[PDB]
């Protein structure tokens, strides 16, 4: 990206860091928890509140030397107080602003914030799983303040969890104990945790909220498909993904020696020696690596990530996608918890700056037979067959008769996030204690307040409502700024954390409370739905039919010769 928004990302942190400092106070606190005693520190916002912070908690011991790409442990206790008055580092990763290898090895840590440690009663405990495809992503404040909920009489909590190949290599060989989904037991030690531990912090473990947007919603939902979890966790919201969109789940175990050979690894395709120079090689090294692994036959099949989560070749003890997730989701006890799901109006405005760089990609529009479904599609996508899919593709996006960008943006909100989200409804109710899911429609529009993920899909003056837009009205980062507080984007904040807490707290998103949504009654989807229904978020709150259903049949019927795998 541009010197000139590196030079101004390079100001903002350093205004990011004097203002962090402005905002601590010199009351600090110490928390009990299972592994030891932790210092804490309490913080203001630019909304004059103030919170709890304890943030640097561990709850793996650092996955490194021989502990690279295994499991996490459980972390060694300590005696005293451990300092948690800061953060730690994020995971390795490419920073995609510099275009440099930052982060560390040592990243398995959670954020505790909460604005009353001795609450009259136990509260709601929110836990938050960050997206990135697996790649990127932090805990750090500069981009998920606690700021707007901890307005609430909530306890919030914010996990890191192991990024890329350093999180999701996958070896065939049963010997060497890399099966892969190390980032995902990291997510599952991480709530094995607070179960354990918000009680601590005066969060009532018997109500817990666990929710992501984009790869943190793929693994929310896994928290809730895998049996590792079970009755960990009450409520689960689904933001902008799932377990079954493509792009969550890859089979990457012939990866490794591809990254291996890119490192300079001299030899053979053996698991073991693959592995031996794996665990040597320097952190950054891989990471920076990790993407030109991907093949051009997998970019044109639509891999998005070469190293992300995995069906495991082998179970071991703490396993957790034994089978593929489609699978998965028939004994998944996560089925019969209160869910919430949700997309933005405009998903697709995400890959402009992708396309940007490729405006060729708009050419597969043409037949669009890269993007029927994988699994339908054959290798070549020549079969006259995976033709007609596309012709079904091309007759639900392509508008005129040359494709355009549009075209193709539109087209990816689909393929990435209502398909996959429509076929798990579908899967779910065959399979299911009757419990609600509800569903919204993230449709509100500003560039008043932003976030750092503008910057990254090129969406200055854009219009529209890209994926993970929505997350500056639910955490501060260090882009935002105090808003007036009879402004529309001060206004979404407190519906958006209102829902999301009335959601967690009750399983039942409604609340005559709620500004807005006084003449909102929000059902449920139910099995015999011909329509999904969705609070439609925008200036107004309001029920409709989901604009997007006539798409989302259009994309179910490719599979009209082949419903055993829709
Ligand atoms: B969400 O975590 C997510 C979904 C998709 Br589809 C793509 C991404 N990327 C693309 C490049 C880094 C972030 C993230």
């Given at each position: 990206?541009?010197?000139?928004?590196?030079?101004?990302?390079?100001?903002?942190?350093?205004?990011?860091?004097?203002?962090?400092?402005?905002?601590?106070?010199?009351?600090?606190?110490?928390?009990?928890?299972?592994?030891?005693?932790?210092?804490?520190?309490?913080?203001?916002?630019?909304?004059?509140?103030?919170?709890?912070?304890?943030?640097?908690?561990?709850?793996?011991?650092?996955?490194?030397?021989?502990?690279?790409?295994?499991?996490?442990?459980?972390?060694?206790?300590?005696?005293?107080?451990?300092?948690?008055?800061?953060?730690?580092?994020?995971?390795?990763?490419?920073?995609?602003?510099?275009?440099?290898?930052?982060?560390?090895?040592?990243?398995?840590?959670?954020?505790?914030?909460?604005?009353?440690?001795?609450?009259?009663?136990?509260?709601?405990?929110?836990?938050?799983?960050?997206?990135?495809?697996?790649?990127?992503?932090?805990?750090?404040?500069?981009?998920?303040?606690?700021?707007?909920?901890?307005?609430?009489?909530?306890?919030?909590?914010?996990?890191?969890?192991?990024?890329?190949?350093?999180?999701?290599?996958?070896?065939?060989?049963?010997?060497?104990?890399?099966?892969?989904?190390?980032?995902?037991?990291?997510?599952?030690?991480?709530?094995?945790?607070?179960?354990?531990?918000?009680?601590?912090?005066?969060?009532?473990?018997?109500?817990?909220?666990?929710?992501?947007?984009?790869?943190?919603?793929?693994?929310?939902?896994?928290?809730?498909?895998?049996?590792?979890?079970?009755?960990?966790?009450?409520?689960?919201?689904?933001?902008?993904?799932?377990?079954?969109?493509?792009?969550?789940?890859?089979?990457?175990?012939?990866?490794?020696?591809?990254?291996?050979?890119?490192?300079?690894?001299?030899?053979?395709?053996?698991?073991?020696?693959?592995?031996?120079?794996?665990?040597?090689?320097?952190?950054?090294?891989?990471?920076?690596?990790?993407?030109?692994?991907?093949?051009?036959?997998?970019?044109?099949?639509?891999?998005?990530?070469?190293?992300?989560?995995?069906?495991?070749?082998?179970?071991?003890?703490?396993?957790?996608?034994?089978?593929?997730?489609?699978?998965?989701?028939?004994?998944?006890?996560?089925?019969?918890?209160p869910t919430m799901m949700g997309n933005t109006s405009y998903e697709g405005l995400f890959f402009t700056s992708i396309l940007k760089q490729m405006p060729m990609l708009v050419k597969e529009l043409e037949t669009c037979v890269n993007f029927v479904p994988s699994e339908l599609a054959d290798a070549e996508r020549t079969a006259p067959e995976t033709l007609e899919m596309g012709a079904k593709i091309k007759k639900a996006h392509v508008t005129g008769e040359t494709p355009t960008a549009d075209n193709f943006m539109d087209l990816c909100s689909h393929i990435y996030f209502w398909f996959p989200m429509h076929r798990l409804l579908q899967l779910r109710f065959n399979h299911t204690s009757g419990t609600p899911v509800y569903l919204y429609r993230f449709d509100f529009d500003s560039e008043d307040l932003i976030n750092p993920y503008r910057i990254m899909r090129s969406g200055r003056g854009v219009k529209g409502v890209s994926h993970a837009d929505e997350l500056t009205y639910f955490f501060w980062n260090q882009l935002a700024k105090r808003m007036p507080k009879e402004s529309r984007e001060y206004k979404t904040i407190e519906r958006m954390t209102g829902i999301w807490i009335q959601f967690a707290t009750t399983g039942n998103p409604y609340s005559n409370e709620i500004e807005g949504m006084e003449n909102v009654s929000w059902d449920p989807i139910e099995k015999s739905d011909e329509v999904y229904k969705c609070l439609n978020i925008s200036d107004e709150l309001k029920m409709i039919d989901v604009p997007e259903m006539d798409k989302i049949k259009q994309w179910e019927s490719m599979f009209e010769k082949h419903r055993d795998l829709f």
């Open positions: 990206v541009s010197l000139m928004e590196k030079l101004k990302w390079k100001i903002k942190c350093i205004e990011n860091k004097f203002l962090n400092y402005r905002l601590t106070t010199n009351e600090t606190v110490v928390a009990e928890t299972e592994y030891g005693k932790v210092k804490g520190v309490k913080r203001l916002t630019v909304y004059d509140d103030s919170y709890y912070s304890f943030e640097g908690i561990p709850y793996a011991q650092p996955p490194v030397g021989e502990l690279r790409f295994k499991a996490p442990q459980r972390p060694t206790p300590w005696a005293g107080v451990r300092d948690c008055c800061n953060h730690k580092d994020k995971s390795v990763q490419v920073d995609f602003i510099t275009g440099k290898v930052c982060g560390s090895e040592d990243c398995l840590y959670l954020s505790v914030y909460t604005n009353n440690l001795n609450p009259e009663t136990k509260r709601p405990v929110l836990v938050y799983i960050h997206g990135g495809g697996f790649i990127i992503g932090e805990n750090h404040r500069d981009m998920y303040g606690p700021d707007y909920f901890i307005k609430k009489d909530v306890v919030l909590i914010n996990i890191q969890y192991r990024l890329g190949a350093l999180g999701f290599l996958s070896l065939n060989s049963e010997d060497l104990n890399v099966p892969g989904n190390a980032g995902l037991k990291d997510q599952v030690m991480a709530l094995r945790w607070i179960k354990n531990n918000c009680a601590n912090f005066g969060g009532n473990p018997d109500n817990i909220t666990v929710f992501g947007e984009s790869a943190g919603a793929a693994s929310t939902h896994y928290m809730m498909l895998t049996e590792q979890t079970r009755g960990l966790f009450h409520r689960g919201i689904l933001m902008s993904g799932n377990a079954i969109c493509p792009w969550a789940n890859t089979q990457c175990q012939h990866r490794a020696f591809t990254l291996a050979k890119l490192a300079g690894y001299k030899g053979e395709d053996n698991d073991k020696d693959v592995l031996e120079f794996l665990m040597k090689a320097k952190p950054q090294d891989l990471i920076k690596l990790e993407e030109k692994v991907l093949t051009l036959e997998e970019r044109t099949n639509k891999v998005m990530f070469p190293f992300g989560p995995t069906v495991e070749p082998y179970q071991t003890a703490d396993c957790v996608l034994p089978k593929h997730p489609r699978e998965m989701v028939k004994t998944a006890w996560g089925n019969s918890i």
